[PDB]
Each structure stands twice: as C-alpha cells, then as structure tokens.
Design an enzyme around this catalytic site. Structure first.
Site, short mmCIF file in Angstrom:
data_model
loop_
_atom_site.label_atom_id
_atom_site.label_comp_id
_atom_site.label_asym_id
_atom_site.label_seq_id
_atom_site.Cartn_x
_atom_site.Cartn_y
_atom_site.Cartn_z
N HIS A 193 -4.56 -9.55 3.27
CA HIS A 193 -3.54 -9.65 4.30
C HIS A 193 -4.08 -10.08 5.66
O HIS A 193 -3.47 -10.91 6.35
CB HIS A 193 -2.78 -8.32 4.42
CG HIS A 193 -3.64 -7.11 4.68
ND1 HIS A 193 -3.24 -6.11 5.55
CD2 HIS A 193 -4.82 -6.70 4.14
CE1 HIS A 193 -4.16 -5.16 5.56
NE2 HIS A 193 -5.13 -5.49 4.71
N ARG A 194 -5.19 -9.47 6.10
CA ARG A 194 -5.67 -9.76 7.49
C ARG A 194 -6.30 -11.16 7.61
O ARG A 194 -6.30 -11.69 8.71
CB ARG A 194 -6.61 -8.66 7.99
CG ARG A 194 -5.93 -7.30 8.07
CD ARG A 194 -6.47 -6.39 9.16
NE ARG A 194 -5.95 -5.06 8.87
CZ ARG A 194 -4.73 -4.64 9.19
NH1 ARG A 194 -3.92 -5.41 9.89
NH2 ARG A 194 -4.34 -3.44 8.81
N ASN A 216 -4.72 -2.21 -4.34
CA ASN A 216 -5.97 -2.17 -3.60
C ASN A 216 -5.82 -1.28 -2.36
O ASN A 216 -6.39 -1.56 -1.31
CB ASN A 216 -6.44 -3.58 -3.24
CG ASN A 216 -7.91 -3.64 -2.87
OD1 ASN A 216 -8.67 -2.70 -3.12
ND2 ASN A 216 -8.31 -4.74 -2.26
N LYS A 267 0.46 -6.65 1.79
CA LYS A 267 -0.25 -5.38 1.66
C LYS A 267 0.14 -4.40 2.76
O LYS A 267 0.27 -3.20 2.51
CB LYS A 267 -1.76 -5.61 1.64
CG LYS A 267 -2.57 -4.38 1.25
CD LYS A 267 -4.02 -4.73 0.92
CE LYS A 267 -4.81 -3.60 0.30
NZ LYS A 267 -5.17 -2.52 1.25
N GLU A 272 -10.90 -5.23 1.59
CA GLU A 272 -10.07 -6.02 0.68
C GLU A 272 -10.82 -7.20 0.09
O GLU A 272 -10.56 -7.60 -1.05
CB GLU A 272 -8.82 -6.52 1.41
CG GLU A 272 -7.71 -5.49 1.60
CD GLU A 272 -7.89 -4.52 2.75
OE1 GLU A 272 -9.03 -4.36 3.24
OE2 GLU A 272 -6.86 -3.90 3.14
N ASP A 314 0.83 -1.21 0.00
CA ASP A 314 0.00 0.00 0.00
C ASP A 314 0.86 1.26 0.00
O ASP A 314 0.51 2.28 -0.63
CB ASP A 314 -0.95 0.01 1.20
CG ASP A 314 -2.19 -0.85 0.99
OD1 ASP A 314 -2.34 -1.47 -0.09
OD2 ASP A 314 -3.05 -0.90 1.91
N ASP A 334 -10.47 -2.87 11.80
CA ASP A 334 -9.43 -3.74 11.26
C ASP A 334 -8.91 -4.70 12.33
O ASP A 334 -8.90 -5.91 12.13
CB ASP A 334 -8.26 -2.90 10.71
CG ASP A 334 -8.62 -2.07 9.49
OD1 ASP A 334 -9.74 -2.17 8.96
OD2 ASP A 334 -7.73 -1.33 9.05
O1 LIG Z 1 -7.97 6.05 7.01
C1 LIG Z 1 -7.35 5.02 7.19
O2 LIG Z 1 -6.15 5.02 7.32
C2 LIG Z 1 -8.07 3.76 7.26
C3 LIG Z 1 -9.38 3.77 7.49
C4 LIG Z 1 -10.24 2.55 7.65
O3 LIG Z 1 -11.19 2.49 6.57
P1 LIG Z 1 -12.77 2.88 6.73
O4 LIG Z 1 -12.83 4.34 7.16
O5 LIG Z 1 -13.34 2.64 5.35
O6 LIG Z 1 -13.33 1.94 7.79
C5 LIG Z 1 -9.39 1.28 7.76
O7 LIG Z 1 -10.20 0.12 7.52
C6 LIG Z 1 -8.24 1.32 6.77
O8 LIG Z 1 -7.49 0.11 6.79
C7 LIG Z 1 -7.31 2.47 7.10
O1 LIG Z 2 -6.17 -2.66 6.38
C1 LIG Z 2 -7.35 -3.09 6.50
O2 LIG Z 2 -7.66 -4.02 7.28
C2 LIG Z 2 -8.46 -2.48 5.66
N1 LIG Z 2 -7.83 -1.72 4.59
C3 LIG Z 2 -8.75 -0.98 3.74
P1 LIG Z 2 -7.82 0.22 2.68
O3 LIG Z 2 -6.67 0.69 3.55
O4 LIG Z 2 -7.35 -0.50 1.45
O5 LIG Z 2 -8.86 1.29 2.38
#
Ligand SMILES: O=C(O)C1=C[C@@H](OP(=O)(O)O)[C@@H](O)[C@H](O)C1
Ligand SMILES: O=C(O)C[NH2+]CP(=O)(O)O
Length: 426
Positions: A384-385, A93, A410, A340, A48, A312
């Site tokens: 990944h999770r 992604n 990821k 994901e 990422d 998460d």
């Molecule tokens: O802003 C961020 O860094 C993130 C927000 C979350 O998404 P949502 O706001 O869609 O829940 C989380 O799931 C993602 O892994 C990281």
């Molecule tokens: O990291 C996670 O568990 C969810 N990530 C969603 P993204 O960061 O791709 O919007």
C-alpha cells in the site's frame, strides 16, 4: 492493472481521514476480550481490519457493523477468546492481527493455526514466540522457527519473560495486551533496543482506555498483573489514521496551497503525527489544532534524521525528498526490510526509476533528487505505501504510473479518490 496520475498543478482542501489501522485493530481485540459492549466509531474499513474482524467472527465474537463498516458494536467476551474447533485463520499480511492474535490465543486451551499471505510467512515472529513459550505457551512453528504459520495450543501462564525489541514493537505490544488476562503476573524484560516506541505508547493508551494499567519502567521492564479483565469504555472514538494523513500533508508541503486533515491533532496518541514536524523542518508551514493538522507549501530543503519514531510515515519523506533541495538521509529504519516488502530495496529501486540517486544502506536510505523527474511505471510490491508514496511524483511536471494501485486497500481503499478530490490537474 495500473493507474496513471496526470501532473497536478495544485493541491488544497480538507481531508476527513479514515480510521487508524493501528488503533482499529487494538480496539477490536480489546473490545472482544473486555467485559461489556463497546461501540467503536470511525473504525477503518481496510484489508488489515477486515482480517481482524473475520478472525474475531470465526472465534465466536459477537459484533455488528454499520452499512459502511465504520461503526462496530462489539459484545465483549469478558475473558480470553475460546473456540472448540481446530481452526485455521488467514490473516492476510496484517501484522496488527497476526502478532496480537498469536499472543492472545496463547491464553487457555485452544488449538488454532494462524497463517496468511506468502509474504506474511516471510515476516518474523520468533521474538514473540520465544517470550510466549517462556511464559508457558505451547506453539509450533509449522514451517520454520521465527516465522508463521503458527499452531497455538494455549497454556500461557505469565512469569518472567524476555522479549527482543529490536525488530518489531508489535511483539511487546502483543505481550502487553495478553498478559493482564493470564493466570499469573508477568514481568517483561526488554533484551536490548526497542524500535517503534510510539506504538508501545498507543498500546498503553488503548489498554488504559479499556481499564488496565501496567508499570512501564523506562521502556526496559514492564510489570503486568494477571487475573485482570478489560472493561469496555462504552463508546470509543477511533482516531483518523496519521499515517494515511502523511500523504496529504506532504502534498500540501510540495504543491499547496494549504491541505488540512481532520480526525487527528496535537493530542493524538499516534506517533505519526510527528511526521508533520519533519515537513516543518523541510520548510513547509504547519498549523495544529485539537482535531486538525494543516500544511502549507514553502520552499523545501532536505533533512537528515533518525526516523525510528515514525517508520511508516517516513516512507512519505523518501518521495517528498524528490522535491527538496539537497540530499535527504533517513536513518535507523532497518525494519523497513521486514514489512510488507523489503522497503529499503523497493524504495531505492523505484526512486531510481524517476531519476534519483539512492544509496541503500543496511538501515538507512540517502536520496539525491535529479534536476528533472523522469516518467516511470512504479512497482508496488503488494505494499500500500509504495503506491501512496509514489503518487506524490505527479506533483511535478511528470505523470507517474502506479502498478497494482488496489494494493492501497491494505489501509486506505479510497486513497486515489481522496487525492483527486484535493488535486487540480495542470
Ligand atoms: O503496532 C502497530 O500498530 C504498528 C507498528 C509498526 O510496526 P513495527 O513495530 O514492526 O515497526 C508499524 O510499522 C505498523 O504499521 C503498525
Ligand atoms: O503499515 C505499514 O506501513 C507497515 N505495516 C506493517 P504491519 O501492520 O502489517 O505489521
């Protein structure tokens, strides 16, 4: 490809965490926009973050990386990113690249297409597009409204916009980081509920580090002044990843021993530090420091909790539940479905293979462990999770086989080696 984890009799030790994905990608974008040169320490090396770095490079941002890609010196642009080329940027992604960059590239007059992996074209972005268009941006959804790929032709001015907070906090995060550089002030009204609120707090902390404040009116209305410029803080230390930490803290809760993670602590800006509170509620003992969190095994009992504040790290509770007495219920996690993979479907499907009874609700999951875990090959859904959560099954008398283990990259390429370092096999 697959990895079989042999049963682990005990976990204990200290894990020096890799950098936070959430902080890393915000800090890179803010450093790219800011005036001055920012030095980031403990940047995460993962897919990422690599996709963000590659996009910034393609957009003309000048930076250097250390050999191990964890120290990054960014020469700030002192303003919106600009490219004279009709680029197409592939963002994997990575929501934390796609959402923030979709907003940022609405400043000015670029002509840039943002795309990614097939799953990313199935992950929603319309709430963000709607708000950006309300502020004057020209955006084309090339395949279908509310999803990437997006063609961004600029023009965001500011003004009065509304953003839906009910599906992702990232849409609001993306607006907040872009609005200070717009030619006019922006008033952002949140339509209804706001999910993942602690990630908004991360964004506001990062923006303040980079010299910009906004008026947050009870998370329902935000007033942002335009015509600003971010200011490099000079050095910035990226926190260790509190979501990555969850696996090791849970492993200590289940099969410790004491497991300590370093690089986060009681004052961290990441909301996922609150995951440790859940382990404590389940019966583990948790010790806090300024730069560590540690968890020691105790007898584990199921919890019934709203997990919207830690969506998460909540996945880690879903597999830790296999080791707890009673039925665990995790509530208010609808957006598991739009990440994901559809994580409510995936988690329920894979949990049943190890013997759990699972009720897959629309926005909740209920998990009743079996008396004895079963051996399974776990599908990981390019998530990944899924791989990291199901690694915990091996803290039992049963091995687990993780399919496509490299998907951990990821956010955590070296996950399995780090778990092995603290594991003693039965
Ligand atoms: O802003 C961020 O860094 C993130 C927000 C979350 O998404 P949502 O706001 O869609 O829940 C989380 O799931 C993602 O892994 C990281
Ligand atoms: O990291 C996670 O568990 C969810 N990530 C969603 P993204 O960061 O791709 O919007």
């Amino acid at each position: 490809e697959s990895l079989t984890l042999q049963p682990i009799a005990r976990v204990e030790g200290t894990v020096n965490l890799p950098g936070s994905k959430s902080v890393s990608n915000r800090a890179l974008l803010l450093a790219a926009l800011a005036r001055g040169t920012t030095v980031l320490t403990n940047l995460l090396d993962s897919d990422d973050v690599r996709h963000m770095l590659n996009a910034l490079s393609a957009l003309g941002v000048q930076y250097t990386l250390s050999a191990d890609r964890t120290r990054c010196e960014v020469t700030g642009n002192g303003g919106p990113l600009r490219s004279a080329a009709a680029l197409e940027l592939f963002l994997g992604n990575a929501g934390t690249a796609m959402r923030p960059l979709a907003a940022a590239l609405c400043l000015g007059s670029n002509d840039i297409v943002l795309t990614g992996e097939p799953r990313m074209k199935e992950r929603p972005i319309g709430h963000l597009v709607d708000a950006l268009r309300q502020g004057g941006a020209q955006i084309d959804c090339l395949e279908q409204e509310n999803y990437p790929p997006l063609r961004l032709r600029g023009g965001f001015q500011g003004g009065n916009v509304e953003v839906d907070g009910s599906v992702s906090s990232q849409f609001l995060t993306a607006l907040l980081m872009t609005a200070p550089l717009a030619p006019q002030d922006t008033v952002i009204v949140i339509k209804g509920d706001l999910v993942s609120k602690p990630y908004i707090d991360i964004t506001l902390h990062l923006m303040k580090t980079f010299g910009v404040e906004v008026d947050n009116q009870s998370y329902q209305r935000f007033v942002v002044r335009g015509k600003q410029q971010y200011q490099s803080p000079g050095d910035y230390l990226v926190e260790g990843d509190a979501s990555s930490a969850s696996y090791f803290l849970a492993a200590g809760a289940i099969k410790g021993g004491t497991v300590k993670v370093t690089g986060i602590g009681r004052n961290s800006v990441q909301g996922d530090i609150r995951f440790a509170d859940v382990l404590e509620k389940m019966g583990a003992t948790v010790t806090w420091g300024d730069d560590f969190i540690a968890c020691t095994h105790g007898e584990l009992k199921a919890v019934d909790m709203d997990m919207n504040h830690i969506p998460d790290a909540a996945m880690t509770i879903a597999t830790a539940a296999l080791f707890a007495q009673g039925t665990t219920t995790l509530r208010n996690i609808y957006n598991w479905r739009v990440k994901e993979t559809d994580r409510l479907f995936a988690m329920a499907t894979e949990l049943r293979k190890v013997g759990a009874e699972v009720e897959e609700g629309e926005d909740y999951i209920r998990i009743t462990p079996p008396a004895k875990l079963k051996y399974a090959e776990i599908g990981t859904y390019n998530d990944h999770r899924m791989a990291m959560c199901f690694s915990l099954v091996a803290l039992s008398d049963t091995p687990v086989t993780i399919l496509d283990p490299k998907c951990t990259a990821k956010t955590f390429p070296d996950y399995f080696e780090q778990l092995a370092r603290i594991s003693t096999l039965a």
